[PDB]
């Protein structure tokens, strides 16, 4: 039936038909995250006393703890959530190398200016983001917490600068800017403006001028020995099985074995030529483990003509079929059928393993090829057999230094030959 | 092969020797700075990083004052002659009494004190010269540190050999740095250090089977190395190898815009008395004048800007038919 699927027809011709290749599905799953339990102090970040002004935005280090972004995303008092490189849903399943938390207060209309590649006074002078920023930005109004009727002037930003700042650049200097041509000194002068600009935060201000507390997370991910993870709980590890593993967020599937790679302490991952992972250091046990996806291979179906018979054979190219008994149908396979795995008709070849055919010793002309000199045929009470192909009939010649053989009679034979010459014209 | 900031091979490095009395000069940190030392008893123990160094802007301070290494970034008012001074004072130990480095630390945003960094290796007593190699990068506000320590037995020059640096720590100092000064252990001994300059280049890093860098070649040092980087191999067969094409870079820039000076009447547009209704929407023609879209894009009283076919940023560098 799978060959009928491949051919999109109800009749199959005599031969071999490669079909959908198999793969061993993982048997179970292992979770190995670092067993830290101390909660990350997001209280001192989101719900602290006061935030440093945008021109001198405070940076608070968070590391070696377990965070849960669900309680931050699910709150209804927040206003905006747009994340770059990450999704709000997928934060709990992944670990962070280091958490750089930037918190500050900006204007309501300047919330757009947080996005990298934008243009505005804040991004131009005191807080610019890299073109490929990764992380999440949190925005919400805090007028009733940081606005006073007499005017809150504790939040400041720079008005002029000599040149655009680099990404993540911080400037503290209060040098007087020389807006005019002539230079000046002192506290103040004509066309000599103080770099910092003040604002009278008051509750009477309408939407678009209200203070909007903003927290930006600029973590970098999965190219380093991460130390901050979600609330996912650890699980015991097993070896020599195809297993759905995930170390520090590295979701993957394969069979793992203790390798001999000497990972240096700043190195956590090992990678192949194709930039795929090859080894990993377990976050709980400091050994090094190789990772390989469990074995797989193609599936070929050996069959005679559909009108002649319905019995078929199966071949597993490139697979030492000692794993086929391990391919028990307790775990599933890409090919659903397994009834041919009964045994007592199993033969190994250099091209793989042939199941469903009886190997014999007598030789014949190669009917339909399998590989590596072995090929099968259907004949006699009839079954699919396998044999080594015969190169021809052996015939020795009687050489001697004084004898010849010359023919006496002749036969005239006629032979046909077919050669394609041309093909149908087509214009599109 | 990696394409990022890297010192060229066979570089004309500036050299120092602490033969007496001497001073440490200040050198720029443009595009990264390479630093090496073949010294005894860890005479070099710190560096000063910044752009103004005179408390006008922030600066970086690293000192290894015996007990531990201190990393501090503040509004430092460094002294004009920073030095460290220390022997056998009734304890058989050597103490560092002087820490005369700065006078003012008004506001500090980044501090770190863990342990001292005089990680001397095998051999002891300085039988073989110790090569402490350092490379510092300041990219997008991140200060990255790499360090090494290896023994050499060459008398005076840089050891002819191959080595690579492990990363030490990443510092989010986020300050402007254009120059730097190095630190010292004043007590009988001579010390030398190199001051190289990192550059954005590419090298072919030959990792061994064990994961240690054994050799490296440049992609633009000389034609042979360019062929090596092009072929991604350390052996070259006899023949002719086409490499990266050259192009003459322009010598200078020329700006030629029409020499009209009268300001455009955008006042009569935005700050006009009244507008025509939407059904009879008004049209005004503006030409032969000087405009500036920056004053339109920088106002905070506006609500929406959707520019199609053009960005608001590139308006001042473009000219309009009508």
């Amino acid at each position: 039936s799978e060959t009928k699927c491949t051919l999109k027809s109800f009749t199959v011709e005599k031969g071999i038909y490669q079909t959908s290749n198999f793969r061993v599905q993982p048997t179970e799953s292992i979770v190995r995250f670092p067993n830290i339990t101390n909660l990350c102090p997001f209280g001192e970040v989101f719900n602290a006393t006061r935030f440093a002004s945008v021109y001198a935005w405070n940076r608070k280090r968070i590391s070696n703890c377990v965070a849960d972004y669900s309680v931050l995303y699910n709150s209804a008092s927040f206003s905006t959530f747009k994340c770059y490189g990450v999704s709000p849903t997928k934060l709990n399943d992944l670990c962070f190398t280091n958490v750089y938390a930037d918190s500050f207060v900006i204007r309501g209309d300047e919330v757009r200016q947080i996005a990298p590649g934008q243009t505005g006074k804040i991004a131009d002078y005191n807080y610019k983001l890299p073109d490929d920023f990764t992380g999440c930005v949190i925005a919400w109004n805090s007028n009733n917490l940081d606005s006073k009727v007499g005017g809150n002037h504790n939040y400041l930003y720079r008005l002029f600068r000599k040149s655009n700042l680099k990404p993540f650049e911080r400037d503290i200097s209060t040098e007087i800017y020389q807006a005019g041509s002539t230079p000046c000194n002192g506290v103040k002068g004509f066309n000599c403006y103080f770099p910092l600009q003040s604002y009278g935060f008051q509750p009477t201000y309408g939407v678009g001028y209200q203070p909007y507390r903003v927290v930006v997370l600029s973590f970098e991910l999965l190219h380093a020995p991460a130390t901050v993870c979600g609330p996912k709980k650890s699980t015991n590890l097993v070896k020599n099985k195809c297993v759905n593993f995930n170390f520090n967020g590295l979701t993957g599937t394969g069979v793992l074995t203790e390798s001999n790679k000497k990972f240096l302490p700043f190195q956590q991952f090992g990678r192949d030529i194709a930039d795929t992972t090859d080894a990993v250091r377990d976050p709980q046990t400091l050994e090094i483990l190789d990772i390989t996806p469990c074995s797989f291979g193609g599936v070929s179906v050996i069959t005679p003509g559909t009108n002649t018979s319905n019995q078929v054979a199966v071949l597993y190219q490139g697979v030492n079929c000692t794993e086929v008994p391990v391919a028990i149908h307790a775990d599933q396979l890409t090919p659903t059928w397994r009834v041919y795995s009964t045994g007592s008709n199993v033969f190994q070849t250099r091209a793989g393993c042939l199941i469903g055919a009886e190997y014999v010793n007598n030789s014949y002309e190669c009917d339909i090829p399998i590989g590596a000199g072995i090929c099968a045929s259907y004949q006699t009470s009839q079954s699919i057999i396998a044999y080594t192909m015969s190169l021809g009939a052996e015939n020795s010649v009687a050489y001697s230094n004084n004898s010849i053989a010359i023919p006496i009679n002749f036969t005239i034979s006629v032979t046909t030959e077919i050669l394609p010459v041309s093909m149908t014209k087509t214009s599109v | 092969s990696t394409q990022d900031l890297f010192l060229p091979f066979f570089s004309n490095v500036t050299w120092f020797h602490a033969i007496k009395r001497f001073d440490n000069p200040v050198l720029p940190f443009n595009d990264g700075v390479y630093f090496a030392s073949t010294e005894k008893s860890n005479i070099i123990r710190g560096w000063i990083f910044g752009t103004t160094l005179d408390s006008k802007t922030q600066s970086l301070l690293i000192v290894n004052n015996a007990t531990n290494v201190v990393i501090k970034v503040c509004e430092f008012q460094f002294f004009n002659d920073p030095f460290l001074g220390v022997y056998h004072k009734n304890n058989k130990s050597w103490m560092e009494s002087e820490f005369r480095v700065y006078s003012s630390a008004n506001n500090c945003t980044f501090e770190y004190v863990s342990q001292p960094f005089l990680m001397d290796l095998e051999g002891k007593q300085g039988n073989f010269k110790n090569l402490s190699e350092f490379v510092f990068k300041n990219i997008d506000g991140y200060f990255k540190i790499y360090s090494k320590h290896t023994p050499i037995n060459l008398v005076r020059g840089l050891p002819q050999g191959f080595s690579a640096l492990e990363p030490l720590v990443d510092l989010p100092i986020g300050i402007n740095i254009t120059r730097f000064q190095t630190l010292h252990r004043s007590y009988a001994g001579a010390a030398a250090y190199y001051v190289g300059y990192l550059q954005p280049r590419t090298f072919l890093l030959k990792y061994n089977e064990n994961g240690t860098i054994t050799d490296a070649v440049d992609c633009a040092l000389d034609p042979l190395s360019e062929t090596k980087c092009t072929l991604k191999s350390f052996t070259v067969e006899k023949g002719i190898y086409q490499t990266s094409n050259f192009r003459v870079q322009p010598t200078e820039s020329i700006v030629r815009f029409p020499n009209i000076t009268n300001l455009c009447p955008f006042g009569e547009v935005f700050n006009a008395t009244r507008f025509a209704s939407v059904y009879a929407w008004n049209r005004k023609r503006i030409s032969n004048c000087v405009a500036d879209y920056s004053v339109l894009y920088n106002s905070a009283s506006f609500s929406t800007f959707k520019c199609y076919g053009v960005s608001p940023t590139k308006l001042n560098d473009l000219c309009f038919t009508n």
Binding site: I406, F410, T411, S413, T416, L419, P420, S422, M423 | -
Partner: protein, 147 residues
Amino acid sequence: LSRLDKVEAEVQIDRLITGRLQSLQTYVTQQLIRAAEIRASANLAATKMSECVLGQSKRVDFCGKGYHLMSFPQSAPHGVVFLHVTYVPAQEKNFTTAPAICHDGKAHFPREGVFVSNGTHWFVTQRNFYEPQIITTDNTFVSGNCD
């Protein structure tokens, strides 16, 4: 188009155009390769016509298996069929041979044919068909001595 207006339609139209253009390009490239193979086959067919049909060929196994005699072309849909007539020997007999004959103290060699004996008498025969002849000087040319 009947569901989406122009601005959001162009998004889907461009994807469809790219997909169909890729399919067309793949088809054209495959057709070019097949055409090259067909040109090779047609050149071989033309050479076979010119050498086997219009003449007699000495090239081994080119115009059929055996010693070539003639050929006849026949048409076919998008092709051509040749009928190679060849000469094949059938029955052979084993004999005793000798490279030369020393009669008057001089070596004798066949002008055409081979020396052959059935066990008691010697004859000369052409190589591809048995026809004994009495040894004659018309059959042999003399050169050198018998040592």
